């Protein structure tokens, strides 16, 4: 892994800042692929369920099903904090499109709700964690709004980075099991559409996010 500093330094070379998501989309995708290739970071995960399972919905225009900017770092920090307890990571296979970002990504939420329920069907003993970044945080919010209490009681923790709905709770869920990380100066957390540097640096919060999750996925 590069250090967090070398990673952020590469992001500052390749990521577009100050543009709207619409104008920046293709450069964001290309920039994330460049960083992923340079550092050997996977932008797609489809693991079987682990002892802990994370379902992660990526941000608008992110490549793959987890992107490079935040997801991979969160998964690495979580697995490190879990020790030998195996973490299975599943990306949420949705378009992460510009249009869905601007409309609210509701149907994607419904499909994620079915993805969640299907993990719980298949892996009744896993400790399930939901994660999101940017639009993916909207998808998690929408999934929770479309789910029943029994499903939601089976979710151990929710971590949202760069939440476009910042200030709204995760519906149907215990707020004490939710962590929302929105940087000061991230326009997306203000309901905006501009991609600024603070939107791109959530890898710095991976260790703190992992530490939030660990006590919520205990078997003791």
Swiss-Prot record:
GO biological process: carbohydrate catabolic process
Catalytic activity: cutin + H2O = cutin monomers
Activity modulation comment: Weakly inhibited by n-undecyl phosphonate (C11Y4). Activity unaffected by paraoxon.
Localization terms from the record: Secreted
Class of the enzyme per the UniProt entry, highest EC level: hydrolase
UniProt keyword list: Disulfide bond, Hydrolase, Secreted, Serine esterase, Signal
Active site: 134, 186, 199
Annotated EC: 3.1.1.74
Region named Lid covering the active site of the uncomplexed enzyme: 15-40
MF-aspect GO terms: cutinase activity
Gene Ontology terms: cellular component: extracellular region
Disulfide bonds: 25-61, 49-123, 182-189
Site (Transition state stabilizer) location in chain: 60, 135
Keyword Secreted: yes
Free-text note regarding domains: In contract to classical cutinases, possesses a lid formed by two N-terminal helices which covers its active site. The lid opens in the presence of surfactants to uncover the catalytic crevice, allowing enzyme activity and inhibition.
Described purpose of this protein according to its UniProt entry: Catalyzes the hydrolysis of complex carboxylic polyesters found in the cell wall of plants. Degrades cutin, a macromolecule that forms the structure of the plant cuticle.
Family: Belongs to the cutinase family.
Name recorded for this polypeptide: Cutinase
Protein source organism: Hypocrea jecorina (strain QM6a) (Trichoderma reesei)
Shown residues in whole-protein numbering: 45 to 248 of 248
